[PDB]
Every structure is written in structure tokens, then in C-alpha cells.
Design an enzyme around this catalytic site. Structure first.
Site, mmCIF file in Angstrom:
data_model
loop_
_atom_site.group_PDB
_atom_site.id
_atom_site.type_symbol
_atom_site.label_atom_id
_atom_site.label_comp_id
_atom_site.label_asym_id
_atom_site.label_seq_id
_atom_site.Cartn_x
_atom_site.Cartn_y
_atom_site.Cartn_z
ATOM 1 N N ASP A 184 0.725 -1.200 0.043
ATOM 2 C CA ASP A 184 -0.072 0.092 -0.040
ATOM 3 C C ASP A 184 0.932 1.496 0.058
ATOM 4 O OD1 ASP A 184 -1.748 -2.143 0.315
ATOM 5 O OD2 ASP A 184 -3.128 -1.004 1.902
ATOM 6 N N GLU A 187 -0.694 -9.857 11.194
ATOM 7 C CA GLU A 187 -0.718 -9.412 9.741
ATOM 8 C C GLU A 187 0.881 -9.172 9.631
ATOM 9 O OE1 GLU A 187 -3.177 -5.970 9.068
ATOM 10 O OE2 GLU A 187 -2.769 -5.850 7.071
HETATM 11 C C1 LIG Z 1 -3.572 1.479 10.858
HETATM 12 S S1 LIG Z 1 -3.027 0.946 9.141
HETATM 13 O O1 LIG Z 1 -2.452 2.108 8.137
HETATM 14 O O2 LIG Z 1 -1.567 -0.210 9.163
HETATM 15 C C2 LIG Z 1 -4.608 0.092 8.523
HETATM 16 C C3 LIG Z 1 -4.281 0.147 6.762
HETATM 17 C C4 LIG Z 1 -5.654 -0.511 6.186
HETATM 18 N N1 LIG Z 1 -5.770 -0.451 4.834
HETATM 19 C C5 LIG Z 1 -7.086 -0.576 4.283
HETATM 20 C C6 LIG Z 1 -7.233 -2.085 3.916
HETATM 21 C C7 LIG Z 1 -8.430 -2.669 3.429
HETATM 22 C C8 LIG Z 1 -8.669 -3.957 3.195
HETATM 23 C C9 LIG Z 1 -7.676 -4.982 3.638
HETATM 24 C C10 LIG Z 1 -6.403 -4.520 4.203
HETATM 25 C C11 LIG Z 1 -5.304 -5.633 4.376
HETATM 26 N N2 LIG Z 1 -4.458 -5.785 3.433
HETATM 27 C C12 LIG Z 1 -3.592 -4.704 3.338
HETATM 28 C C13 LIG Z 1 -2.344 -5.175 2.516
HETATM 29 O O3 LIG Z 1 -1.556 -4.218 2.437
HETATM 30 C C14 LIG Z 1 -2.928 -5.846 1.075
HETATM 31 O O4 LIG Z 1 -1.510 -6.189 0.340
HETATM 32 C C15 LIG Z 1 -3.796 -6.706 1.319
HETATM 33 O O5 LIG Z 1 -4.356 -7.414 0.103
HETATM 34 C C16 LIG Z 1 -5.000 -6.368 2.059
HETATM 35 C C17 LIG Z 1 -6.017 -8.007 2.414
HETATM 36 O O6 LIG Z 1 -5.265 -8.667 3.289
HETATM 37 C C18 LIG Z 1 -6.145 -3.221 4.457
HETATM 38 C C19 LIG Z 1 -6.680 -0.671 6.656
HETATM 39 C C20 LIG Z 1 -6.935 -1.031 8.077
HETATM 40 C C21 LIG Z 1 -7.940 -1.565 8.586
HETATM 41 C C22 LIG Z 1 -9.051 -1.246 7.674
HETATM 42 C C23 LIG Z 1 -10.476 -1.717 8.079
HETATM 43 C C24 LIG Z 1 -10.625 -2.416 9.149
HETATM 44 N N3 LIG Z 1 -9.259 -2.563 10.139
HETATM 45 N N4 LIG Z 1 -8.064 -2.123 9.880
HETATM 46 C C25 LIG Z 1 -5.787 -0.484 8.891
#
Ligand SMILES: CS(=O)(=O)c1cc(NCc2cccc(CN3C[C@H](O)[C@@H](O)[C@H](O)[C@H]3CO)c2)cc(-c2cccnn2)c1
Length: 763
Positions: A536, A733
Site C-alpha cells: 500500500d 498481519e
Molecule cells: C493502521 S493501518 O494504516 O496499518 C490500516 C490500513 C488499512 N488499509 C485498508 C485495507 C483494506 C482492506 C484490506 C487490508 C489488508 N490488506 C492490506 C495489504 O497491504 C494488502 O496487500 C492486502 O491485500 C489487504 C488484504 O489482506 C487493508 C486498513 C486497516 C483496517 C481497515 C478496515 C478495518 N480494519 N483495519 C488499517
């Protein structure tokens, strides 16, 4: 055709609702679904706050997950609920027979923990819904006037399922009894059933539906002069009035004091023999035996992870991953405008794309279905395109036919152009979990084609009753070949789609390279992100620019073309294989010409200067390794040697806990959201481990270096995930490279479960 039918029958039923603690549905869009709820009740207002239904993770839940699972046979899930003071086991088992996907049974067992009041009252609900026009479901009335002293029998019928019966057994445990006046009209306390009808599209909304009925029950009390001067006990105020009958919703409710258990018995009429609790117990014991034997064969853990502690760890990581499989059905939200701003042809394109998004042209389309594993029950319970490629690597080892089934399900989503949305949010139930701003999918947004890696493994295996079914597509070469024959055009379509929609620009610029064709740029970047790449917030050229080129994307196209060579070869697609060969030759050269930095000793994304010249933009980390990670480099390549140096460099990427996503030396290390800017991710580490192993087990100048790095990185990765699991009960994760701690989301099974395959070795 025959193996397909047997596979279909075998997989039709399951607990295919991983978004909730426990429920079942068949792989049919509009059919019969069940779900479990429970919660302690200590007051007149607490049950709304204690009741459990959809999966979450917070201080009130110690942990939960599958101890064993195989979607053909069933499994056992354990739930450790601190808030409700309960350790629950849900056992699920399938019993083949008849013409409608067989029968199934579940046992729900609750044991109060040491902290709970010994006389705790727990409300338990089994909620049953059925969607469809010409289908019926009816609760057989009790003999007793106020509810059920024994089993509750539901009789139903649909085109899909034929005739069936669903029994919720009496169960074991104390049933509290009320001596209040109310008991004259509501009974002293007993199992109750409410049979109801709502429009089909809202039946998924079990919690609001239940609470509507609980509230009506309470309004009836108020109206009938049951008041605070002499109130019935809380558990009785929250016990529904019995009203069984016909409908498309049936709520079966029990209240227990102390420990409890009950069974759910689904009997397919066409199977003849109706399922009993004795069958449930036999079949559960047997599934456990079979799971044990298969695991020992499929995941033979190698030194130094042969011990029992690592076996239990591996069984947990594996069972959670395969146990995450869901069946999803409904409409998806898609922007089909193909607004020209989405071409991203100008400088500052992200502003133009935002403008087009602000037109809100998206609309629901479908319906679609998907059978897939998921990254995370509480947080991400749906299909993610590049995650699934990693999920299926251990699943394919276990059951190649199941993996192929999931690949087929995904490719069935692909549109006429070759696009599969990278995030599959199918139906109102799936949407409920997702903020609306993040639901819309974009036909120009790609994601890594990791599903090709699974196909590669299958191809390799092809070259070299539930038992039989799981490997039929390898054991019968003609079966496997026909599968590939059918899938191949869609793989080609997707390849073509990447080249059409994600092309980079060589010709507009002062750019010299072996090939004028091979260059790639992920669409959908913003100033601080490239979500479509999967990494991301990994640092990319600043500003984003239509002249960017992304070395990871070119590498992925490399992966696809190699798979297409192997599959095309198998199918005798002589003309296609010639074309692919030229493409691969061009990518091999262009990787060097456009992305290799001699100064830095690694690969880099590129951009176009303020002066309109090609410039490399190096940020040492996962991206820098991509041609190596994706298996594109020759074993004696001098570039490979420099990449091994970087990988093994403690001052760059090598932490005691695995490879850092970004170098400690990079200017963006540990900045902003710090998602892919330092932490250790298991999916990329896995690719490194596999590629190191490949070099370690072949003649070449780097054999010994690779052997050392393989041994150590294998150990570092497994041990980090293991230690955290022992300490927290979770797969995480990602992992902190300074402290080794698991961080970001829990229950990530999820590609963290790749740890089972790393332990098994022998790639
Ligand atoms: C504090 S945070 O900035 O660390 C952070 C960043 C993000 N991003 C958005 C996001 C949406 C969908 C799935 C993912 C996970 N993951 C990200 C991977 O990077 C991908 O490669 C991979 O396909 C994908 C699927 O597993 C993340 C989300 C959260 C969050 C969102 C909603 C609920 N709870 N937590 C926290």
C-alpha cells in the site's frame, strides 16, 4: 464432468460463513442459512451488549479459531469469550448421501470458565433463514403449551435441497425456572421458537431481526402490567413468546444456567437414513482421525520444527486458513463509467481521477458468487485477489482439487475485458462490514496475479472417497489437462488485460531499451499510496507521474508469461508459446535496461524527471528484490549475487525476525503509516525463502550463500510467528523487526499461515 459433479456434491455444504462465529450455508446464492448467537444476561439491559454473532477482536474476546478443519469433512472450532465467561466448542461434520449435497450436524458446547458466576444465565439462539420463491420451511409445533421440552424439528423443502429436516436437540444443562406470575402466560422457562417472514433480501440481518422480536416481547410486558414494582427475572423478560409455524425465518432460543450443550442435525431426505446425535459423535471422531493422518503426510515438519509444539502450531495456522473459506453471493458496486480521467495520461492525474470518482457513476451489478478463503475473519472476511494466491499455496498441498475449485470460482468473475475486481464485496451482508467510500471497484485497478503461482505448482505436480476426490485432477492427467484447457483462455485474457490497461510509456520519452513494448505502470496511484500493487504505502516516485515504471509489476507480467508458456505448451498452443517466448525475452532484457541500478546494486522503479528524462528511484526493500522474488533471474546472474548481498545485509533488510519491507537506510523507513515501510510481512518473506531454496539446491556460484540465508531466514520467520502465536494465540498481519512483536491485525490467516509450508520445506 463426473469428477466435477462429485466435487460439487462433496463441497456443497459447509460452515461457509466465516464473517460470523458459527453458521452454515450451502454453495447456493438463495438457500438455507444458519447462525449461532449467545450472551450472558445479568441485568435488564446487558444482553444487547453481550450477545455475540459477527466476528470481532477486542479485550472481551481471548481468542477463537479452528483446531482442525477440512471443508469436505468438517472440523472443530474453539471460542474463548472473556466477556461472556464461556469457552465454547462448535463441532461440524458432513455426512455424504442422497442427491442434494448430503447431510450435516453440529454440536454446540459451552463451559463456563473459572471466573464466571457458577449460576450464570446464558441465552443461546439458533437462527435459521431460507431465501427463494418456491421453497418452504416450517417448525413442527410443540405438544407443550408454552414451548418445547425436547427437540425442535424444522421441516423444509427447496428445488436446490429437495426435502430436508433440521433438528435442534433438547441438549444438556440446567434450564432456569421462573416462579413469577408471568410464567402462567409464558411458561416457567423452556425452549421457544418464533417463525416469521421478511422479504428475502433482509434475512441476513439476524441481530436486528432477533432484537425486534425481543423488543416486541418487552412492549407486551409493559402493556400487560408487568412493571418495576414486581419485574420478572431478566432471562424471562428476554425469552421470546413461543410461536412456531411457517416462514422464511425461524428463531430457536434456549436459556441455560451453568454449562450447556445441544446438537443441530440436518437430514437430507434423499439420503434416506436421518442423522442422529450418535452419528454426529462417530463422524466427529472419524474426521479428527483423518485430519491427523493427512496433516502428518502433507505437512511433514522438518528440523528444527519436528517437535510437538511446532506441530500444534502448524495445525492451528493451517486449520485457521482453510477454515476461513466462505461462500459469498450478491451484487458488487462498480464504476462502469470508464471515465477518460482513469487513463491517468497527464501529470497530476490523481486529481483528475478524484474528479471522476466524485461524479459517483458507480452502480450495483451481478449478482456474483465466490468461493474463496479470506485474509481475516474479524477484519477482512472476503476475497482479495493477490492474497488468495498465497492462501491457496498451503491449501493446494492439502487438497489440490479444492484449490482448483477456488481458482475457478475467482476466474468466473472475470469480465469481457479480462478484469477481476481486486476486492470482492458480494451482497448487502458483505457490504455491511465495509465503509461505503471503500466499496466501489474500478475496472482499471489491477492486483498481483499470485493465483498463477498456485497454477505453477499444479502444473509441476501434473508433470511429475474424500481421499480420491482431493487429488483427482492430478491423479487423472486428462482431468487436469481439461481443467487447464478451460481456464487457459481466461488466463490469456487477463495477461492481455494487464498489457492493455497497465502499460507503461517508453516511446514518449528519451528511453532506450531492448524492447519498445515491455514497460508497466500500476494504475490507481495517489500521492502517498499504490494500493493496487498490494504494497500500500511502499515509497514510489514522487510525484506520481504517467511516465512512472514499476519493477514489481513488470516482474508479475514475467510470472504470468512463464505460466502461459508452460500451460500453452501442455495444450499445444504452439503459436501462443512463440509469442510468449518473445515477450519473456523482452522482459528479461527490459528489467535490466529500465530498472537495474548499477550504482545501487538493486532494481528500482523509474520515473521521468522535471527535465523529461528517465530517472531511477531506488528505495531498498521488497520492491528492489522483485525479479528475484518472482523467480525471473538465472542462478549464476551477477545481479542475483548483489541482491543476495542486500537480502543478507543486517544494516539494510535482514532483521533477526525476517526481511524488513523497507531498508533501515531508506529515507522513508518507519514514516507515515509505516505499513510497508519497515515491518516484516510473511507473504514476501515466503517468496524469498522459496527462491533462496531454489538457488541452494542447484549448482552455481551462490549455492552456499543461498543455503545459509535459506536456513536462517526459514528459522527466523517460523520462530517469529511461532513465538507470537504461543504468547498471544494469534497469527498477526505483520511483525516488528526491532522487537519481533506481532502488530496490525490479529487472526490474519491470511497469508501468515504460509508458515506451515515453510516448516514442511522440500519446495
Ligand atoms: C493502521 S493501518 O494504516 O496499518 C490500516 C490500513 C488499512 N488499509 C485498508 C485495507 C483494506 C482492506 C484490506 C487490508 C489488508 N490488506 C492490506 C495489504 O497491504 C494488502 O496487500 C492486502 O491485500 C489487504 C488484504 O489482506 C487493508 C486498513 C486497516 C483496517 C481497515 C478496515 C478495518 N480494519 N483495519 C488499517
Amino acid at each position: 464432468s463426473e469428477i466435477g459433479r462429485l466435487n460439487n456434491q462433496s463441497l456443497l455444504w459447509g460452515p461457509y460463513r466465516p464473517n460470523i462465529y458459527f453458521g452454515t450455508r450451502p454453495r447456493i446464492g438463495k438457500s438455507l442459512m444458519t447462525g449461532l448467537m449467545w450472551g450472558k444476561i445479568e441485568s435488564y439491559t446487558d444482553f444487547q451488549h453481550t450477545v455475540r454473532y459477527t466476528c470481532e477482536q477486542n479485550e472481551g474476546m481471548k481468542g477463537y479459531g479452528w483446531d482442525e478443519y477440512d471443508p469436505r469433512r468438517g472440523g472443530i472450532q474453539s471460542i474463548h469469550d472473556i466477556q461472556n465467561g464461556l469457552d465454547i466448542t462448535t463441532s461440524f461434520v458432513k455426512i455424504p448421501g442422497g442427491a442434494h449435497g448430503g447431510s450435516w450436524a453440529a454440536r454446540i458446547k459451552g463451559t463456563l470458565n473459572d471466573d464466571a458466576p457458577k449460576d450464570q444465565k446464558t441465552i443461546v439462539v439458533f437462527y435459521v433463514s431460507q431465501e427463494g420463491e418456491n421453497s418452504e420451511l416450517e417448525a413442527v409445533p410443540s405438544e407443550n403449551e408454552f414451548g418445547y421440552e425436547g427437540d425442535v424439528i424444522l421441516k423444509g423443502r427447496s428445488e436446490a435441497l429437495g426435502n430436508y429436516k433440521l433438528v435442534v436437540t433438547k441438549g444438556k444443562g440446567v434450564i432456569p425456572q421462573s416462579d413469577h406470575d408471568l410464567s402462567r402466560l409464558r411458561g416457567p422457562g423452556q425452549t421457544v421458537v418464533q417463525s416469521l417472514t421478511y422479504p428475502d433480501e433482509v434475512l441476513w440481518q439476524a441481530k436486528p431481526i432477533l432484537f425486534q422480536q425481543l423488543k416486541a416481547g418487552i412492549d407486551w410486558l409493559v402493556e400487560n402490567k408487568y412493571d418495576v414494582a414486581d419485574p420478572p427475572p431478566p432471562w424471562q423478560v428476554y425469552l421470546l413468546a413461543n410461536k412456531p409455524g411457517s416462514g422464511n425465518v425461524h428463531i430457536v432460543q434456549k436459556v441455560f444456567e451453568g454449562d450447556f450443550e445441544f446438537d443441530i442435525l440436518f437430514s437430507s431426505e434423499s439420503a434416506g437414513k436421518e442423522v442422529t446425535s450418535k452419528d454426529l459423535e462417530r463422524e466427529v471422531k472419524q474426521a479428527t482421525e483423518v485430519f491427523g493422518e493427512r496433516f502428518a503426510r502433507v505437512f511433514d515438519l522438518k528440523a528444527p520444527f519436528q517437535g510437538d509444539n511446532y506441530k500444534k502450531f502448524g495445525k492451528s495456522m493451517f486449520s485457521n486458513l482453510i477454515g476461513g473459506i466462505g461462500y459469498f453471493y450478491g451484487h458488487s458496486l462498480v464504476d462502469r463509467s470508464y471515465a477518460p480521467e482513469y487513463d491517468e495520461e497527464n501529470e497530476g492525474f490523481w486529481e483528475d481521477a478524484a474528479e471522476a470518482r466524485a461524479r459517483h457513476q458507480e452502480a450495483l451489478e451481478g449478482p456474483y458468487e465466490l468461493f474463496t478463503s479470506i485474509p481475516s475473519r474479524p477484519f477482512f472476511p472476503r476475497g482479495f485477489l493477490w492474497d488468495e494466491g498465497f492462501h491457496l499455496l498451503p491449501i493446494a498441498d492439502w487438497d489440490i482439487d479444492l484449490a482448483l475449485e477456488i481458482i475457478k470460482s475467482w476466474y468466473n468473475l472475470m469480465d469481457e475485458d479480462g478484469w477481476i475486481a481486486r476486492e470482492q464485496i458480494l451482497g448487502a451482508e458483505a457490504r455491511s462490514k465495509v465503509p461505503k467510500e471503500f466499496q466501489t471497484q474500478y475496472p482499471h485497478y489491477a492486483n498481483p496475479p499470485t493465483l498463477f503461482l498456485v497454477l505453477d505448482n499444479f502444473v509441476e505436480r501434473l508433470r511429475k472417497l474424500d481421499e480420491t476426490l482431493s487429488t483427482a485432477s492430478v491423479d487423472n492427467p486428462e482431468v487436469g489437462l481439461e481443467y487447464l484447457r478451460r481456464l487457459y483462455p481466461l488466463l490469456r485474457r487477463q495477461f492481455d488485460w494487464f498489457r492493455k490497461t497497465q502499460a507503461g510509456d517508453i516511446k514518449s520519452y528519451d528511453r532506450e531499451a531492448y524492447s519498445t513494448k515491455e514497460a508497466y505502470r500500476w494504475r490507481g496511484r495517489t500521492v502517498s499510496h499504490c494500493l493496487t500493487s498490494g504494497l500500500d504505502d511502499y515509497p514510489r516516485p514522487q510525484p506520481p507521474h504517467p511516465g512512472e515504471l514499476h519493477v514489481d509489476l513488470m516482474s508479475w507480467v514475467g510470472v504470468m508469461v512463464k505460466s502461459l508458456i508452460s500451460i500453452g505448451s501442455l495444450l499445444g498452443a504452439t503459436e501462443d508459446v512463440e509469442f510468449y517466448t518473445k515477450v519473456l525475452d523482452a522482459i528479461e532484457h527490459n528489467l535490466d535496461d529500465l530498472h537495474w541500478s548499477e550504482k545501487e546494486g538493486c532494481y528500482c522503479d523509474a520515473t521521468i524527471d522535471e527535465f523529461e528524462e528517465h530517472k531511477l528511484v531506488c528505495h531498498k526493500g521488497y520492491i528492489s528484490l522483485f525479479p528475484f522474488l518472482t523467480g525471473l533471474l538465472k542462478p549464476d546472474s551477477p545481479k542475483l549475487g548483489k541482491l543476495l548481498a542486500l537480502i543478507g545485509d543486517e544494516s539494510e533488510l535482514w532483521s533477526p525476525y525476517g526481511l524488513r519491507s523497507l531498508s533501515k537506510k531508506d529515507e522513508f523507513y518507519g514514516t507515515a503509516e509505516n505499513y510497508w515501510r519497515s515491518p516484516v510481512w510473511i507473504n514476501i518473506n515466503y517468496l524469498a525463502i522459496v527462491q533462496l531454496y531454489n538457488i541452494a539446491t542447484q549448482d552455481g556460484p551462490y549455492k552456499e550463500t543461498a543455503r545459509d540465508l535459506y536456513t536462517r531466514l526459514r528459522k527466523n520467520i517460523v520462530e517469529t510467528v511461532y513465538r507470537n502465536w504461543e504468547e498471544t494465540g494469534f497469527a498477526w498481519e505483520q511483525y516488528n523487526p526491532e522487537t519481533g512483536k506481532g502488530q496490525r491485525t490479529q487472526h490474519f490467516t491470511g497469508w501468515t499461515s504460509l508458515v506451515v509450508k515453510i516448516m514442511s520445506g522440500h519446495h
